[PDB]
Design a protein around this ligand. Structure first.
Ligand SMILES: CC(=O)N[C@H]1[C@H](Oc2ccc([N+](=O)[O-])cc2)O[C@H](CO)[C@@H](O)[C@@H]1O
Length: 153
């Protein structure tokens, strides 16, 4: 009646595991920058969608808003940052993250790391964030482990 979800965010690597199996893994050098988004079915944990939005670059946040607005309220939403996700994470995207109940997403800054798991229509199940300590540095890696309640019937 739960999913065991692990979410890792860091300078050089992201992964998401569901029930002990990796559903997203990106350790490649200069690829996959930005906010990775995974959508799960809330009864089975099956992956319904996997995206990456390079929100270090313009226009990617607008794509993220359009995509997230089409996700159904009951889905499990998972976000994780690789490298840098904030430079072009602008106010409409930050407001949308706030509407999910995210505390760190709306405040995401330069080279911060961030892991998030929540039901789209609420509540948030888990969240971790590490602030970069200097412009030339990254947040520390964060590994979030959350038991997500499953729906049924
Ligand atoms: C050449 C280089 O280091 N580029 C990196 C880039 O490095 C920067 C170095 C200096 C500045 N600056 O504005 O002074 C910006 C990015 O940072 C990006 C976000 O972390 C990285 O994705 C990118 O690989």
């Amino acid at each position: 009646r739960v999913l065991d979800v692990e979410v890792y965010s860091s300078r050089s690597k992201v992964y998401v595991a569901v029930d002990g199996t990796t559903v997203l893994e990106d350790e490649a050098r200069e690829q996959g920058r930005g906010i990775h988004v995974i959508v799960l079915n809330q009864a089975t944990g099956h992956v319904m969608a996997k995206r990456v939005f390079d929100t270090y670059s313009p226009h990617e946040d607008e794509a993220m808003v359009l995509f997230l607005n089409m996700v159904a309220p009951g889905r499990v939403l998972i976000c994780t940052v690789k490298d840098e996700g904030s430079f072009h994470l602008k106010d409409t995207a930050k407001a949308l993250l706030r509407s999910l109940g995210s505390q760190a997403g709306p405040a995401l800054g330069w080279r911060d790391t961030w892991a998030f798991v929540g039901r789209k229509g609420g509540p948030v199940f888990g969240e971790k964030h590490s602030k970069s300590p200097a412009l030339s540095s990254w947040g520390d890696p964060v590994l979030l482990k959350t038991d997500v309640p499953l729906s049924s019937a």
